[PDB]
DNA sequence: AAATTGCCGAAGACG
DNA sequence: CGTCTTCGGCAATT
């Protein structure tokens, strides 16, 4: 049965090239454009994150996330509060972005308008693709593209500072992949580089136009991709574990639940990935993820869920402190809600997988 | 030093 | 299952 659904949540290797032709073309040609010349994001180097390069995009290829990454030499990050997440950024010259600062501070605001201006006028230039650019959002770090293919495809271009120093202190106990992935690992991936992305920390009802927030698509890119207590997991001579295949199935089961009801508009597909992090993390053996156990992994999964949901409580795999369930962020009802919904399909057999 | 190229793992396709 | 294919990612090369 979940065997049926995956087989239709699979991705048809025509629509991959048909939809790759295109997306890469597009890419390829802003990212030439940042290059040049008298730019000031002329260093940017593009990372492709999220679901479809992490293989675990469902259903279609119809969503494709990319940053387009500045490396930014002596920053000093202020914590925004104690949010753990957002931070203020301060310099420590004749620069390319003193035209961004807002007082001494590095205006996400100004940084984006800058970034999301130049990519409008370089796909109006665009004359061999139908490809727009789609209307700004709230508290949104991308400068989200729309193309007809003829099929809808979104791409979402997401600036992000780089840089080089260790983490910051609220991600000094997250990552806990020391039963799991281990220490070597999870050493080397916090020597890596972290990002910042012009998203605004909400305050209140407005946003906050100076805040970044750190993002780590880049480390979850490669935990997926090497997520096994064995590093054959999954190879050519290794054992095939069903780890995805139980992301797959709990994204498309949030995805139906929330095309018909609007009340879970503030629940999105990273608070499934965040809670199956954890899960990867309480039950580290591949022997545990083997396929003949998908039902009950998938369950388990379920349940971890439903207990975040009604605990209010999904700590930030990176950053622990920040509660993406808390009551600030998604209303106690919306939680309520989403906790019905997914018992009942819990225990019906999960109608809602026959469309 | 932008652009090309080699190399192969991940996973779809099909018997 | 095994074998084949395409795509993505990386960095040496020029
Ligand atoms: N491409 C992309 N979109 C993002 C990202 N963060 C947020 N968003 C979209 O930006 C709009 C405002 O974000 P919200 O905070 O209101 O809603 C998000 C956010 O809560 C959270 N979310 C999603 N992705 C993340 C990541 N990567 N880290 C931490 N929180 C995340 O859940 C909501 C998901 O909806 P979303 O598709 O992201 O839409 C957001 C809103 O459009 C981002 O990093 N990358
Ligand atoms: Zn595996």
């Given at each position: 049965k979940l065997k049926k659904v995956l087989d239709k949540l699979r991705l048809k290797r025509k629509d991959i090239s048909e939809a790759a032709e295109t997306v890469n073309k597009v890419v390829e040609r802003l990212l030439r454009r940042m290059q040049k010349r008298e730019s000031e994001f002329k260093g940017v180097e593009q990372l492709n994150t999220g679901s479809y390069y992490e293989h675990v995009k469902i259903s279609a290829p119809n969503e494709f996330d990319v940053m387009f990454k500045l490396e930014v030499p002596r920053i000093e990050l202020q914590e925004y509060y104690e949010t753990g997440?957002?931070?203020?950024?301060?310099?420590?010259?004749?620069?390319?972005?003193?035209?961004?600062?807002?007082?001494?501070?590095?205006?996400?605001?100004?940084?984006?308008?800058?970034?999301?201006?130049?990519?409008?006028?370089?796909?109006?230039?665009?004359?061999?693709?139908?490809?727009?650019?789609?209307?700004?959002?709230?508290?949104?770090?991308?400068?989200?593209?729309?193309?007809?293919?003829?099929?809808?495809?979104?791409?979402?271009?997401?600036?992000?500072?780089?840089?080089?120093?260790?983490?910051?202190?609220?991600?000094?106990?997250?990552?806990?992949?020391?039963?799991?992935?281990?220490?070597?690992?999870?050493?080397?991936?916090?020597?890596?580089?972290?990002?910042?992305?012009?998203?605004?920390?909400?305050?209140?009802?407005?946003?906050?136009?100076?805040?970044?927030?750190?993002?780590?698509?880049?480390?979850?890119?490669?935990?997926?991709?090497?997520?096994?207590?064995?590093?054959?997991?999954?190879?050519?001579?290794?054992?095939?574990?069903?780890?995805?295949?139980?992301?797959?199935?709990?994204?498309?089961?949030?995805?139906?639940?929330?095309?018909?009801?609007?009340?879970?508009?503030?629940?999105?597909?990273?608070?499934?990935?965040?809670?199956?992090?954890?899960?990867?993390?309480?039950?580290?053996?591949?022997?545990?993820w083997d396929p003949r156990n998908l039902s009950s992994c998938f369950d388990k999964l379920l349940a971890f869920f439903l207990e975040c949901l009604r605990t209010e409580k999904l700590d930030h795999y990176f950053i622990p402190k920040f509660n993406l369930f808390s009551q600030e962020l998604i209303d106690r009802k919306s939680k309520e809600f989403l906790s019905k919904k997914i018992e009942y399909e819990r225990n019906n057999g999960f109608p809602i997988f026959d469309k």
């Open positions: 997440a957002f931070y203020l950024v301060k310099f420590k010259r004749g620069n390319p972005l003193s035209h961004f600062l807002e007082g001494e501070v590095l205006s996400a605001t100004k940084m984006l308008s800058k970034f999301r201006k130049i990519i409008k006028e370089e796909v109006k230039e665009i004359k061999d693709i139908d490809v727009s650019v789609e209307k700004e959002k709230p508290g949104s770090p991308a400068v989200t593209l729309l193309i007809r293919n003829p099929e809808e495809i979104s791409v979402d271009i997401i600036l992000a500072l780089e840089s080089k120093g260790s983490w910051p202190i609220s991600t000094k106990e997250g990552l806990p992949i020391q039963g799991w992935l281990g220490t070597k690992v999870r050493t080397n991936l916090r020597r890596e580089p972290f990002y910042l992305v012009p998203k605004n920390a909400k305050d209140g009802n407005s946003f906050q136009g100076e805040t970044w927030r750190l993002s780590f698509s880049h480390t979850e890119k490669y935990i997926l991709n090497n997520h096994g207590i064995e590093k054959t997991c999954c190879e050519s001579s290794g054992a095939k574990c069903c780890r995805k295949e139980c992301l797959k199935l709990m994204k498309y089961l949030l995805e139906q639940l929330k095309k018909e009801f609007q009340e879970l508009d503030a629940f999105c597909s990273y608070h499934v990935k965040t809670a199956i992090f954890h899960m990867w993390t309480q039950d580290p053996q591949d022997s545990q």
